[PDB]
Amino acid sequence: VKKFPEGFLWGVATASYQIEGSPLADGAGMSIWHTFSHTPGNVKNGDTGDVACDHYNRWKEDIEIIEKLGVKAYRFSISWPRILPEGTGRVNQKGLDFYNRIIDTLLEKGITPFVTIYHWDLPFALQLKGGWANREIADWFAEYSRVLFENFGDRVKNWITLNEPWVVAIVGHLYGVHAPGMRDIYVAFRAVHNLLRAHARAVKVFRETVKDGKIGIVFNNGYFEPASEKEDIRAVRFMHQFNNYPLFLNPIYRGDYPELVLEFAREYLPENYKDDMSEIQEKIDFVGLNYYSGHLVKFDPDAPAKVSFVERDLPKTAMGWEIVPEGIYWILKKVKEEYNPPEVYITENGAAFDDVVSEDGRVHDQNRIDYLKAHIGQAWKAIQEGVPLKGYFVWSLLDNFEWAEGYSKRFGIVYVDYSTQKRIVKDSGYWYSNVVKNNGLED
Numbered sequence: 300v301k302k303f304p305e306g307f308l309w310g311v312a313t314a315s316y317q318i319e320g321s322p323l324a325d326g327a328g329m330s331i332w333h334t335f336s337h338t339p340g341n342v343k344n345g346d347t348g349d350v351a352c353d354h355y356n357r358w359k360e361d362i363e364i365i366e367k368l369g370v371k372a373y374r375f376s377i378s379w380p381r382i383l384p385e386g387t388g389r390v391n392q393k394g395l396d397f398y399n400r401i402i403d404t405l406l407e408k409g410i411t412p413f414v415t416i417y418h419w420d421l422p423f424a425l426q427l428k429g430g431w432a433n434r435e436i437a438d439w440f441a442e443y444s445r446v447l448f449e450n451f452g453d454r455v456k457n458w459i460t461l462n463e464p465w466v467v468a469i470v471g472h473l474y475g476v477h478a479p480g481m482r483d484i485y486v487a488f489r490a491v492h493n494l495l496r497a498h499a500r501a502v503k504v505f506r507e508t509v510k511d512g513k514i515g516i517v518f519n520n521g522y523f524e525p526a527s528e529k530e531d532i533r534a535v536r537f538m539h540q541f542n543n544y545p546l547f548l549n550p551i552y553r554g555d556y557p558e559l560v561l562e563f564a565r566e567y568l569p570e571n572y573k574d575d576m577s578e579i580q581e582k583i584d585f586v587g588l589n590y591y592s593g594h595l596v597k598f599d600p601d602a603p604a605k606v607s608f609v610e611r612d613l614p615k616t617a618m619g620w621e622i623v624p625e626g627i628y629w630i631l632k633k634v635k636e637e638y639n640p641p642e643v644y645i646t647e648n649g650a651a652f653d654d655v656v657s658e659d660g661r662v663h664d665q666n667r668i669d670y671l672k673a674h675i676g677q678a679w680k681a682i683q684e685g686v687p688l689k690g691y692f693v694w695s696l697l698d699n700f701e702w703a704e705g706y707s708k709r710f711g712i713v714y715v716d717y718s719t720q721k722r723i724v725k726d727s728g729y730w731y732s733n734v735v736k737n738n739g740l741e742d
């Protein structure tokens with residue numbers, strides 16, 4: 300048996316653009332994911348978020364599923380352009396109404412809301428003014444955060460500024476695979492910097508408006524290992540510093556970017572970037588870490604960053620991501636060791652597999668159970684060695700729009716039949732329900 304501390308928060312997680320559909324309903328402005336997915340060639344099968352899971356209409360039913368499952372926390376995001384259609388200025392009362400109903404329902408049923416302020420659906424109107432590339436986004440984001448705090452902060456007490464800002468910056472503005480679809484290394488590092496400043500400004504407003512709450516920030520993380528005992532160890536050191544929480548937590552805790560990031564990227568950061576560092580050090584209450592995968596890494600003289608991945612013969616998910624459960628232990632231990640934050644949450648962990656509804660009307664995703672079980676086990680371990688892990692969130696409640704992969708990748712513990720919008724709880728969902736009831740594993 301592996302029992303978790305009393306009060307440990309078992310959660311599920313979603314994001315606004317991935318589940319809601321109806322992106323232009325009730326006076327909402329367009330987002331960058333609306334225009335990105337409506338551009339031919341950007342998303343698999345030309346999928347968009349126009350309908351998605353239709354959560355915009357079926358929100359009550361989805362929450363009832365969370366209730367029925369006994370899950371104690373729900374992490375969801377708010378669509379910035381539903382709230383401020385032009386990004387700043389005018390507030391759309393109908394957008395506030397939609398999240399107000401979700402918030403009140405959750406509290407009625409005793410589910411704890413964890414609100415992600417920004418999960419990638421920037422208002423299109425702000426992208427026209429440069430989006431994350433524009434220093435002024437620190438103001439725009441502050442104003443948006445303030446609206447949320449004032450309207451919801453009486454009831455919501457756990458807040459996340461940014462979801463995966465490395466992805467936002469690098470995959471959105473260097474790789475061009477996500478909105479707004481740009482390929483410019485200098486823009487991508489200005490986005491990194493501005494994301495930090497916007498985060499710090501939001502936290503500052505939070506101290507003024509929600510005096511009894513807690514606020515953090517969420518990072519993607521990979522478990523990187525060297526291909527050989529050789530400068531292979533250093534390329535792993537680079538990937539951890541660049542791709543993992545240190546890119547943002549070295550600034551927040553120590554007032555500068557990590558060493559190896561500066562050696563690679565100093566030419567691409569703003570000239571006097573150090574002038575912003577003391578404001579960036581605004582105290583946070585928790586660190587959220589997402590974790591999915593491990594990667595074997597080698598120095599490579601001819602790669603963009605002097606680094607390439609090498610495929611390993613390990614079990615992979617439908618994403619082709621290698622399943623390495625000890626990565627979640629490693630990253631929890633390392634975060635304590637490097638920055639010692641007062642609280643940590645696993646804000647996302649999960650997997651995509653080729654789910655099908657059997658003749659018996661059930662989704663037998665034993666592979667997802669194996670995945671979840673192995674990772675929850677490893678997180679248990681870190682708790683026993685003193686990591687202040689206060690919660691764990693399965694990505695995702697529902698199969699949903701998986702960004703540039705569209706509907707073809709299913710992460711849910713609940714199946715969605717997109718032709719009817721019927722929800723079918725998967726075996727993994729029933730399994731997790733039992734984990735939550737028992738506050739841990741038992742076999």
Ligand SMILES: OC[C@H]1NC[C@H](O)[C@@H](O)[C@@H]1O
Pocket residue numbers: 314317462463589647694701710
């Ligand atoms: O790729 C899986 C999952 N990981 C990271 C993102 O936060 C989420 O939106 C995405 O669907």
